[PDB]
Amino acid sequence: KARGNEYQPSNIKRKNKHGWVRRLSTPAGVQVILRRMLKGRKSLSH
Amino acid sequence: ADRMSKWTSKRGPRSFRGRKGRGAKGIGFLTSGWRFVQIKEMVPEFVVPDLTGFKLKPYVSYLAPESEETPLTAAQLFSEAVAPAIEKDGFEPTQEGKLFQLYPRNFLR
Amino acid sequence: GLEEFFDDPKNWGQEKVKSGAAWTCQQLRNKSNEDLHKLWYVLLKERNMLLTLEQEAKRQRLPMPSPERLDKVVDSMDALDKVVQEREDALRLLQTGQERARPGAWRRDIFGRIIWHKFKQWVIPWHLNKRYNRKRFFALPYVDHFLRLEREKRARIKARKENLERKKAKILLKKF
Amino acid sequence: ARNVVYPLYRLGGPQLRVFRTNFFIQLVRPGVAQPEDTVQFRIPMEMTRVDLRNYLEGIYNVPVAAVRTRVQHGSNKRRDHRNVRIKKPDYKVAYVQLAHGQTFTFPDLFP
Amino acid sequence: ANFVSWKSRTKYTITPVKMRKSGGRDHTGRIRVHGIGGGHKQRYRMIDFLRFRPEETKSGPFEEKVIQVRYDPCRSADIALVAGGSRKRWIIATENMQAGDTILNSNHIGRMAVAAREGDAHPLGALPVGTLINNVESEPGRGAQYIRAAGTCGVLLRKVNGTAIIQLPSKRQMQVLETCVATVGRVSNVDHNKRVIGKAGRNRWLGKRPNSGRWHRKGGWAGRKIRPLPPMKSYV
Amino acid sequence: YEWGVRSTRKSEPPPLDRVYEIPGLEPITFAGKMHFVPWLARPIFPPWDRGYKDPRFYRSPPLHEHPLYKDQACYIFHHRCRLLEGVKQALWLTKTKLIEGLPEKVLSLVDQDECVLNVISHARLWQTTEEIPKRETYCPVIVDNLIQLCKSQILKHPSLARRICVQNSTFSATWNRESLLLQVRGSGGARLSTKDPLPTIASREEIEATKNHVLETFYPISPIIDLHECNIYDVKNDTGFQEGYPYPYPHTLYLLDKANLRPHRLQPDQLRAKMILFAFGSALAQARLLYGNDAKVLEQPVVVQSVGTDGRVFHFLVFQLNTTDLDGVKNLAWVDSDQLLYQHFWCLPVIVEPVGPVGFKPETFRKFLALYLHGA
Amino acid sequence: MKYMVYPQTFALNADRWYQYFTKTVFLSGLPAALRAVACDCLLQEHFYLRRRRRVHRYEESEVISLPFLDQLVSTLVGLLSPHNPALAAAALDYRCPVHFYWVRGEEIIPRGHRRGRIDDLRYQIDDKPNNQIRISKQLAEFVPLDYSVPIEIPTIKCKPDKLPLFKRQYENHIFVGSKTADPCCYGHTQFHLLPDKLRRERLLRQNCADQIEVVFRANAIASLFAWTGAQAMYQGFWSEADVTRPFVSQAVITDGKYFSFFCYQLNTLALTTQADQNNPRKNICWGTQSKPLYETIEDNDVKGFNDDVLLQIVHFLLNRPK
Amino acid sequence: LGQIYANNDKLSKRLKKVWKPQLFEREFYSEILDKKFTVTVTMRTLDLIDEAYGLDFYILKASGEDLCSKFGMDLKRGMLLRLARQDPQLHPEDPERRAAIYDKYKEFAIPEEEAEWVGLTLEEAIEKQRLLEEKDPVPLFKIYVAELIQQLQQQALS
RNA sequence: CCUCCGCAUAAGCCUGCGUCAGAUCACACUGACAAUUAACAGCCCAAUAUCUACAAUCAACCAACAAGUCAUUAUUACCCUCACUGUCAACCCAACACAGGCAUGCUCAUAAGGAAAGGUUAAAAAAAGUAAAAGGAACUCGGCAAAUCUUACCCC
RNA sequence: GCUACCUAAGAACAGCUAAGAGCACACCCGUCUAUGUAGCAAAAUAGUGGGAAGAUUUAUAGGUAGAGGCGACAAACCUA
RNA sequence: GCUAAACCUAGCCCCAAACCCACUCCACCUUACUACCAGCAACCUUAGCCAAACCAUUUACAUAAAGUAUAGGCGAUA
Ligand SMILES: [Mg+2]
Ligand SMILES: [Mg+2]
Ligand SMILES: [Mg+2]
Ligand SMILES: [Mg+2]
Ligand SMILES: [Mg+2]
Ligand SMILES: [Mg+2]
Ligand SMILES: [Mg+2]
Ligand SMILES: [Mg+2]
Ligand SMILES: [Mg+2]
Ligand SMILES: [Mg+2]
Ligand SMILES: [Mg+2]
Ligand SMILES: [Mg+2]
Ligand SMILES: [Mg+2]
Ligand SMILES: [Mg+2]
Ligand SMILES: [Mg+2]
Ligand SMILES: [Mg+2]
Ligand SMILES: [Mg+2]
Ligand SMILES: [Mg+2]
């Protein structure tokens, strides 16, 4: 069927999936954040 | 799906909305069956003086003369409470048994 | 009453109101603690009134009668804050010998950059605070490289600034 | 008082005082026809309903009968030459009912 | 990978405990067992398998009265609610075990043998040779692990020295200490073997996902193997 | 078998750092800072006690050090205690003979149904917006309505104005048997309270004649079996009222059982047993109040009644308490068990069978009325 | 979605608003054994009945007061069955809900896709009277159907939302204590107690001492109106087929000590702007100021007991249906 | 951690290999500390100890970069401290014995202020330093008072 | 004339056809000013032991099988009350003012909500319907499609 | 946040005939035809249809991740 | 004659030198930007493309000695 809308929003999920806390939780996440900072991004995490 | 907009209490689902708040400062605690318990001591009581017979005003007449600035450092203060010391020839060691603690502040503003 | 939230009924609709000068700091310093406190409340009400007036103006599509006065008031307030704060600081110095009242310390976070961690104020000791122990204050080796990169970036920026300045100077010289 | 660390009240401890209050307030004209005795203020976000009540009582000596606050959203839509969103600030509105049937019509300025 | 096991209830109880399903998953989160999950919901009646255990401050053999004989969702053998003294407990029921019926729970290895009633529990020393048993411990005071399914029964083959020899249902022999406790008779709900399932719906309800469609060519193992029954296993 | 599983228990604290074994140097730990660092050793903190007391984060002492902890365990009964043996055990606990019919006098005191029917309908259909009301709503309601109806014969009997049904009344009563200490506790049910005591049903010959018949043993179930075994109890008996309270004499314990699930409800035998216990307990308390706590056979034996539970079924009980000396003569109870007004109610019409109570019988109602009357 | 009207309201000068909503006219005034019993009732809950678990000040109105009230109702009823035979047959209902739903006035939709359309604005009351007395025969009339009484209804100069009164959409319910299939469809006396929020101490602490009486009055206006309305509905009548005979009911609101007494006279269900232009009829509410049943309780002795209140209560109970 | 050629010929696969040492658990007495430690020791360690004779001796003798263990370093430090202080290790009734023990290790035994820092990591050392030079700040008031006093004295002199 | 939609709540979005001023299929587009007020809903619950066998299905008879969704008690601890946040809209996800997707409660023809036709002409071709003389599968790979409805037999 | 499978705690299934029963709404799927093919749409519309008290459908939160997972194997599905 | 064209200075690149930055107040590891209550913790050879004309051992990561000794499917190359 139509497959365009993969996204189907719910804030809680987003926060758990992609939030600051989650990022902090691993080394990889931390590294990601660091990279973002280096780049100079306005929103490091969600 | 904005990352840029500031996250706030308006933004989430129900639970999220309930949780956050603005910088309100809580006035008590919450118990039993969601009965809030307003403690009187947590609420800030505004100590307003009486302004009757008070000759000061919110602006200062232009005729008042100019004078150079003097940052009120500790030394100056000491000097202006050193007469008694001089006479001798008023200090707390700790302030843990004191209401208004100067260092790790108790007093507000 | 609520009459204090507006100025004298004489002054409504003049477009020019006389109100001379802010409180300079010296004057404030000269005044007593109690006196200062008293003055603060006088100031506050005035400020509120000014704000109200501004709001009214905004509503009505009209300009403020005299917006300098508000500014002056604000300045005065600031001065007052400074004076009292200064005094407090002095007192602290005399007693405990502490610059800043609220305690903190130099803490290296996850990202490696050293931060002034201001202390938060609690009921139980740090060792059995469940939340606080999650908030980790240390780097690990994966951060060093990133730090280095950051430093390099900073240096580049600095270089750009300096060279630019030099170029500007050269241009100026050429001109004159 | 806004933007200050509040001391921690344990249980037997003293009353919290605010000497020299930080937040300052502005009473406004209502937009949508309120009852007589209602007064509409703009509280700065951090200040509470109780605080407002106290504030009015102390500094202005008004008999406040009830207070009802509400957080108004300030619009985020509206952009620059850059296409970056200018945010109008969100503020707190206070509906303060006076006591003793005191009554208060908001006066005409700019006649 | 959040996985705290539901098995977390230190106090013994009769109240049926709430039970999280697995899906054939590990604590990692990956499928370690195929064909599991999506059954009907169940609650666990904690079965006391150590048959002989006296209540607090009591010593010797005691009696018990059966109150109810319920169906357990967790297993093929149906269960019995028992009471004795001041405490109740769930035990695995025997064949022909009725409500209001009495059960003995002995520690006593007698001089002579003990004529057993289908339900009651004794050491293997006390039993006659050739008596059918179930809920057999592997050591003294260990707890019953063997012969627990519906209709199952191992015969007591012989006694030599301070040890008894058991024939397990699979038929492989097992030597145990003479003092280890067992219950006599065969385990409740015979005819579980012959229960026709009728449809795949039933299977689903029970909690078994279907077999995969992947066609596997049969290998070496797949022929019938005729072997001698492996050596009698001892716990001594 | 140990129940618990290792992965769900509080994890063992990690192995103590190797510097602590060395006598005697100062181990450099992160307690100098105020946070964990992997390098630097794990510090050992002193067990912190909060000085001042905050109720909302309070921790009680261990059961050992309590102001009234006794070694001999008291076995205590409440509304939620729910006996394995039902009535025979209750009797044993109470020390009493069961009699299968209600007494004659009460029956006589009988010698209209539309009203009853109406009440039933109200309970089971009319009293709330939602169709088919729940038993947590209707069971008490029905009882209340019945009580009201009964009262509505004050015009006939003017002595019925000397009573009052009261809601949050507890009691406590403690006694011995073999000897193990026993206690009963208050209800979540109504108490019909009168000014005058009830008259004695059995004569002093009848009472005497109890001596011959024995209490039923029921081994091996222990009699206490389903009661709360309790150390830390306090032995004081208590009628639920201070001295000088008018309407002090307990007439009938209108105790009920709400609860919409079959399991939460009592099962009838258990309920009956509970009722009996309550009757004993209140009666016992009354006796204690009257005479000394010194045990004996009574001169004027007190009588308490109790009506059962449930919108559908009814268990009627009268209790003749005649001996404070337990461990001789015994007490005697008269039950009319599981009598039941109305077998089934239909809230919606089936498709044939109309909207109302099928299988109605007024005998139960009559019995109830009689019970209510007794004193007048 | 309809305005969710709460009888026991915290809102200030809510009475006038309530009147406007309902179209009532408020008027001040009205159109030994027992005493002993009352005293006993008072004592039982405050002194004699031994509480196992301790009672706190948040827990006081629920645990102490409501049961006392119930006792008063029931015992008094029992007493008065000789003096008044209708209370014998009457059905007495404890905490049994009273719902009433009506429409008063138009509202053009201010914004959205429904903007600029006449929405007739709706209300609902959902009360739970501590207890009430229902009868199968209707009570007397008090005042004639169509009575002028020229004192006039409050105006109200703005939207009803500005008095903190909020909207919601749920089940529209016209419900007297029990369903239509029930002979006891009429009522008479209604007993309310106010919760912790509307204790007079609290009011005193705030600056709303004026509103100590007001709250009670508001409650009377609401709950009574709902009950009468419900009754009217049960006998066929509604906004178009407006009541032929005046429906009447009675109330006695309280907070522990302080009682007052409120008769109600229902002359109209025609509240829709369709049926109000040709309408001189209007509902009526009679009422006393809240008077203390006692001064205080010193141990097990009521200090300054008030018999007038008791008498009033008796009168309320003891009025007949002719 | 290394790699092997398959059959020790280079024209076969190269494939990665971890050679692990054979770990054991053993008790160990030490005269300097008077305690029995249970350690994850290997046979080479044992051999080394034997060569050096005492475990204590080995600990002392063996250099920090050859010890290759933090625990070992710590132990060494402790021993050094003991040597320095001359602490009551064996308590009353064994003073002579203690003396004898000390004399057994007359070699080694550095001044006490060096032995405190032996066998520390860098971070640990830093922490120690911080602890040492911690101190609550001196009230300025006191300083001012002192100054005043000095001034007064000066005045008196002149 | 349509109504196969509507009003709510949930989730989502986040001021997105309110007032005034202003400009440039036809005039929801820019600037200023205004608004959503808690009772609904979120935001909970001092310890230590100790208790919780009997489903739900109008719960009553029957009747089962897959065996189930709503409870304490004892003792110690405890007077302080109603703060904080959500509350707008023509709305979300599909790049769009997209015939698609989108949980639940009422409403089941509506008391809500809407407009198939910018104007004209009336050609072919194309699309969607309705029509039918006589015949009635002669169509075609096949009765596909349509129309009226139902007989028997294989394979798998 | 799609889909594949699972875990927790939820919700839905009118009406007529008499059980992974039949007809038939809501809901789910997607047989055949036509239209559409830079489309209303990166898989839709119109009809016609298979299912619709169950191995049913479905909202919420959590879990398994690529040398992997998940799979009533179609080498499916794992954000066009 | 419309669309358009045109335009220098924003700044930037490579060096040289010199070792950088980081707390007005408030908030920020819980769903970061959240005033206020009883639990764990970092270190573990790069690989492969590619070249060898495939590919399998193998294939680089001041000056001069010296592309010398060496190494190497003794070849690519190192
Ligand atoms: Mg198979
Ligand atoms: Mg197969
Ligand atoms: Mg809305
Ligand atoms: Mg698209
Ligand atoms: Mg319409
Ligand atoms: Mg059109
Ligand atoms: Mg056209
Ligand atoms: Mg034709
Ligand atoms: Mg042809
Ligand atoms: Mg043909
Ligand atoms: Mg066809
Ligand atoms: Mg079917
Ligand atoms: Mg079908
Ligand atoms: Mg295949
Ligand atoms: Mg294939
Ligand atoms: Mg190649
Ligand atoms: Mg090539
Ligand atoms: Mg090739």
- Contact F312/F361 with Cβ under 8 angstroms? no
Instruction: Report the residue of F76, F80, F219, F221 to disrupt the E interface, i.e. the one with the largest count of E CBs within 10 Å.
Output: F221
| Domain end call among E106, E140, E158 | E106
| Domain end call among E106, E123, E139 | E106
Residue G275: CB atoms within 10 Å: 17
* The nucleotide closest to C164 (CA, C1' atoms): K11
Say how many Å lie between the CA of residue H9 and the centre of ligand 12.
72
- Contact F280/F319 with Cβ under 8 angstroms? yes
Question: Rounded to whole angstroms, how far apart are CA atoms C7 and G318?
Answer: 63
What burial letters (b/e) apply to A6-31, b meaning 16+ CB within 10 Å?
Answer: eeeeeeeeebeeebeeebbeeeebbe
Q: Quick one: CA dihedral E169, E170, E173, E177, positive or negative?
A: negative
What region does H121 belong to: left with phi over 0, alpha with psi -120 to 50, or beta?
beta
Question: Rounded to whole angstroms, how far apart are CA atoms H37 and H15?
Answer: 40
- Contact C146/A36 with Cβ under 8 angstroms? no
- Contact G264/G250 with Cβ under 8 angstroms? yes
Q: Is the peptide bond before F179 cis (omega within 30 degrees of 0)?
A: yes
Q: Does residue E201 belong to any structural domain of this protein?
A: no
Q: Examine the domain organization and report whether E4 and E81 are in the same domain.
A: yes
Q: Measured between beta carbons, which residues in chain F are less than 8 angstroms from residue D10?
A: 52, 54
Question: In terms of Cα–Cα distance, which of D92, D89, D97, D8 is closest to D48?
Answer: D92
How buried is F129 (Cβ within 10 angstroms: 0-12 exposed, 13-18 middle, 19+ buried)? Answer: middle
Residue E201: CB atoms within 10 Å: 9
What's chain G's Rg over C-alpha atoms? Answer: 20
B89 and H149 within 8 Å at the Cβ level: the answer is yes
Q: Examine the domain organization and report whether E138 and E180 are in the same domain.
A: yes
What's chain D's Rg over C-alpha atoms? Answer: 18
Q: Measured between beta carbons, which residues in chain H are less than 8 angstroms from residue F25?
A: 74, 77-78, 81
Residue B27's SS3 state is: coil
Size of interface A-B (CB pairs under 8 A): 16
Measured distance between the N- and C-terminal CA atoms of chain C, rounded to whole angstroms: 67
G3 CB contact with strand I at below 7 Å: no
Question: In terms of Cα–Cα distance, which of G55, G76, G44, G78 is closest to F169?
Answer: G44
CATH of residue E65:
2.40.50.140
Q: Which of B49, B73, B102 sits opposite C95 (nearest CB)?
A: B102
Question: Rounded to whole angstroms, how far apart are CA atoms E207 and E203?
Answer: 6
Instruction: Report the residue of A32, A34, A36 to disrupt the C interface, i.e. the one with the largest count of C CBs within 10 Å.
Output: A34
Cα angle G49, G55, G58; round to 5 = 135
C138 and F34 within 8 Å at the Cβ level: the answer is no
Neighbours of ion ligand 1 (CB under 5 A): E 211
The first and second tokens of residue G286, run together, are 């009679």
Question: Rounded to whole angstroms, how far apart are CA atoms E64 and E55?
Answer: 12
Instruction: Report the residue of D10, D15, D24, D79 to disrupt the B interface, i.e. the one with the largest count of B CBs within 10 Å.
Output: D15
Question: In terms of Cα–Cα distance, which of E220, E140, E222 is closest to E182?
Answer: E140
DSSP A1-46: ----------HHHHHHHH-HHHHHHSHHHHHHHHHHHHHT-S-S--
Provide φ and ψ at G91, rounded to 5°. Answer: -90, 120
Residue C45: CB atoms within 10 Å: 16
Q: Measured between beta carbons, which residues in chain D are less than 8 angstroms from residue B38?
A: 50
F209 CB contact with strand I at below 7 Å: no
DSSP F338-358: S--S-SEE-SS-B--B-SSEE
Report how far apart, in Å, the C-alpha atoms of F348 and of each of B16, B97, E110, F126 are.
Answer: 43, 75, 67, 12
Domain count, chain E: 2
Q: Examine the domain organization and report whether E80 and E115 are in the same domain.
A: no
G97 and F128 within 8 Å at the Cβ level: the answer is yes
CATH of residue E167:
2.30.30.30
Residue F335: CB atoms within 10 Å: 22
Q: Which of G11, G163, G207 sits opposite D99 (nearest CB)?
A: G207
Q: Does residue E57 belong to any structural domain of this protein?
A: yes
| Residue H136, C-beta contacts closer than 8 angstroms, at least 6 positions apart | none
Provide φ and ψ at G175, rounded to 5°. Answer: -145, 115
- Contact G48/F245 with Cβ under 8 angstroms? yes
CATH of residue D67:
3.30.70.330
Domains of chain A as residue ranges with CATH: 4-46 (1.10.287.3980)
Residue F164 pairs in a beta bridge with F193
Give the residue nearest to nucleotide K19 (CA to C1').
C155
In strand I, the nucleotides that come within 7 Å of a protein beta carbon are 7-18, 30-60, 66-90, 92-95, 100-101, 105, 112-114
Chain D residues within 8 angstroms (CB to CB) of chain G: 32-38, 63-66, 68, 97, 99-101
Question: Rounded to whole angstroms, how far apart are CA atoms A31 and A14?
Answer: 19
Domain count, chain D: 1
* The nucleotide closest to E202 (CA, C1' atoms): I66
C6 and D39 within 8 Å at the Cβ level: the answer is no
Q: Examine the domain organization and report whether E82 and E164 are in the same domain.
A: no
Neighbours of ion ligand 4 (CB under 5 A): A 4
Q: Examine the domain organization and report whether E7 and E80 are in the same domain.
A: yes
Q: Measured between beta carbons, which residues in chain H are less than 8 angstroms from residue F33?
A: 127
| Residue G164, C-beta contacts closer than 8 angstroms, at least 6 positions apart | D68, G10, G11
Question: Rounded to whole angstroms, how far apart are CA atoms E226 and E231?
Answer: 15
DSSP G222-234: HHHHHHHHHHHHH
Say if G208 is an interface residue toward chain D (CB within 8 Å): yes
Say if E84 is an interface residue toward chain F (CB within 8 Å): yes
Per residue, the 3-state secondary structure of C85-154, as one string, reads HHHHHHHHHHHCCCCCCCCEEEEECCCCCEEEEECCCCCCCHHHCCCCCCCCCCCCHHHHHHHHHHHHHH
Size of interface A-C (CB pairs under 8 A): 21
Å from H6 (CA) to K58 (C1')? 15
Q: Examine the domain organization and report whether E98 and E113 are in the same domain.
A: no
The first and second tokens of residue F323, run together, are 């001996």
Which residue does chain A place closest to B4, by CA atoms?
A43
Q: Examine the domain organization and report whether E111 and E36 are in the same domain.
A: no
D99 CB contact with strand I at below 7 Å: no
Provide φ and ψ at G85, rounded to 5°. Answer: -75, -20
Instruction: Spell out which residues of D between 15 and 74 contact strand I, using CB within 7 Å.
Output: 28-32, 34, 40, 45, 48-50, 68-74
- Contact E157/E166 with Cβ under 8 angstroms? yes
Indicate the domain borders of chain G: 1-322
Q: Which domain holds residue H135?
A: 1-158
Instruction: Spell out which residues of G between 49 and 68 contact strand I, using CB within 7 Å.
Output: 52-54, 56-58, 60
Q: Measured between beta carbons, which residues in chain A are less than 8 angstroms from residue B12?
A: 11-12
Q: Examine the domain organization and report whether E135 and E178 are in the same domain.
A: yes
The first and second tokens of residue H103, run together, are 């004399």
Which residue does chain B place closest to H156, by CA atoms?
B89
How buried is E63 (Cβ within 10 angstroms: 0-12 exposed, 13-18 middle, 19+ buried)? Answer: middle
Measured distance between the N- and C-terminal CA atoms of chain A, rounded to whole angstroms: 31
Measured distance between the N- and C-terminal CA atoms of chain E, rounded to whole angstroms: 42
Say how many Å lie between the CA of residue G111 and the centre of ligand 6.
25
- Contact F284/F326 with Cβ under 8 angstroms? no
Chain B closest-CA separation from residue D50 CA (Å): 8
Q: Measured between beta carbons, which residues in chain C are less than 8 angstroms from residue D104?
A: 2
Chain H residues within 8 angstroms (CB to CB) of chain C: 137-141, 144
Residue F43: CB atoms within 10 Å: 14
Q: Which of C19, C88, C91 sits opposite B59 (nearest CB)?
A: C19
Instruction: Tell the residue number behind the tokens 């905490």, with chain if given.
Output: G95
Report how far apart, in Å, the C-alpha atoms of B93 and of each of C96, D57, G163, H120, H139 are.
Answer: 8, 40, 58, 37, 9
Give the residue nearest to nucleotide I14 (CA to C1').
B11
What burial letters (b/e) apply to F150-161, b meaning 16+ CB within 10 Å?
Answer: bbbebeeeeebb
Å from G67 (CA) to J47 (C1')? 69
- Documented resolution in Å: 3.5
Long-range residue pairs from C113-121, CB within 8 A, at least 24 positions apart, any chain: C113/C147, C113/C150, C121/D5, C121/D7, C121/D8
Question: Rounded to whole angstroms, how far apart are CA atoms E7 and H157?
Answer: 87
- Contact G297/G303 with Cβ under 8 angstroms? yes
Which residue does chain C place closest to A23, by CA atoms?
C110
Query: DSSP alpha helices (H): ranges in chain H?
Result: 43-52, 55-61, 64-67, 70-85, 95-104, 112-115, 122-132, 140-157
C126 and F48 within 8 Å at the Cβ level: the answer is no
Which residue does chain F place closest to G66, by CA atoms?
F167
Domain count, chain H: 1
Q: Which domain holds residue E8?
A: 1-106
Q: Examine the domain organization and report whether E88 and E4 are in the same domain.
A: yes
Q: Residue G302 gets which letter from DSSP?
A: B
Q: Does residue E160 belong to any structural domain of this protein?
A: yes
Which residue does chain E place closest to F226, by CA atoms?
E86
Q: Does residue E202 belong to any structural domain of this protein?
A: no
Helix axes F135-151, G66-80, angle to 10 degrees: 30
The first and second tokens of residue E233, run together, are 């296993």
Q: Examine the domain organization and report whether E63 and E120 are in the same domain.
A: no
Q: Are strands B45-46 and B35-38 parallel, antiparallel or unpaired?
A: unpaired
Q: How was this structure determined?
A: cryo-EM
Say how many Å lie between the CA of residue F156 and the centre of ligand 4.
85
